[PDB]
Design a protein around this ligand. Sequence first.
Ligand SMILES: *[C@@H]1O[C@H](CO)[C@@H](O[C@@H]2O[C@H](CO)[C@@H](O[C@@H]3O[C@H](CO)[C@@H](O)[C@H](O)[C@@H]3O)[C@H](O)[C@H]2NC(C)=O)[C@H](O)[C@H]1NC(C)=O
Ligand SMILES: *[C@H]1O[C@H](CO)[C@@H](O)[C@H](O)[C@H]1NC(C)=O
Lengths: 175, 55
Amino acid sequence: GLFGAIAGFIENGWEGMIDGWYGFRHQNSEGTGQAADLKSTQAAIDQINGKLNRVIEKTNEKFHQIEKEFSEVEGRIQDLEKYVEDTKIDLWSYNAELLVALENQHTIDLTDSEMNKLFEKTRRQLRENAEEMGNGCFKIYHKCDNACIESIRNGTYDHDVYRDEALNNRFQIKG
Amino acid sequence: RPWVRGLSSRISIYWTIVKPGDVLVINSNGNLIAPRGYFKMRTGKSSIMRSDAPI
Ligand SMILES: *[C@@H]1O[C@H](CO)[C@@H](O[C@@H]2O[C@H](CO)[C@@H](O[C@@H]3O[C@H](CO)[C@@H](O)[C@H](O)[C@@H]3O)[C@H](O)[C@H]2NC(C)=O)[C@H](O)[C@H]1NC(C)=O
Ligand SMILES: *[C@H]1O[C@H](CO)[C@@H](O)[C@H](O)[C@H]1NC(C)=O
């Protein structure tokens, strides 16, 4: 969408991630692992639910109106009676069509935004300790066990603690 | 007129709403199908629907 993250720099999606909408996957010295991000997931869910409320269950209440089906040909009034209703239905059909279009464009660009936001949140936490591959992955230039990976996932990663190590590898010498 | 239920004559129905403080006066020297009273009128959420759906 507008943000170029989902169906853009992030190749495809994980049918495997079933505990969230957004999350992480990693590989360190000891192995691999994966875990869903709740925050971004709730932002997306929350916005879509808000949007869903405005649309859903908001019906008017109408009682006696005009007639809309006729047994005999009459002329001037029934023409008008039919034109009024027909006119009403087309303007309402335009209304529905446009709403779903604008709503859907919006939901897509929105969820795109939330992926990318996560990405920039993580990018900023990692400071000079990581470089971006460009497929949604950061190459962490220092040893990061699962606990280290988790500190990132829950935003408590302290980059000063791993700076010198990281810098060194990011800028090694041919020697 | 076309025979209906054996008759070829008809009745034409009419109505007259009488607002409070007003008064109704019927005058006729023939062919009247006189009223017997009045129906009370209400304004509410009612209406009618042509339908063959089972309630
Ligand atoms: C004016 O013309 C109309 C139409 O020709 C006449 O109406 C007809 O009246 C007769 C009365 O004999 C009706 O007869 C009845 O028919 C029914 C159904 O067939 C039956 O139940 C009875 O046994 C009887 O024969 C006839 O149906 C009816 N036709 C129509 C269209 O209404 C009317 O009498 C004429 N008046 C004069 C002065 O010519
Ligand atoms: C650190 O992140 C969240 C903050 O609420 C906490 O609930 C989570 O469980 C923490 N991670 C671990 C493994 O405790």
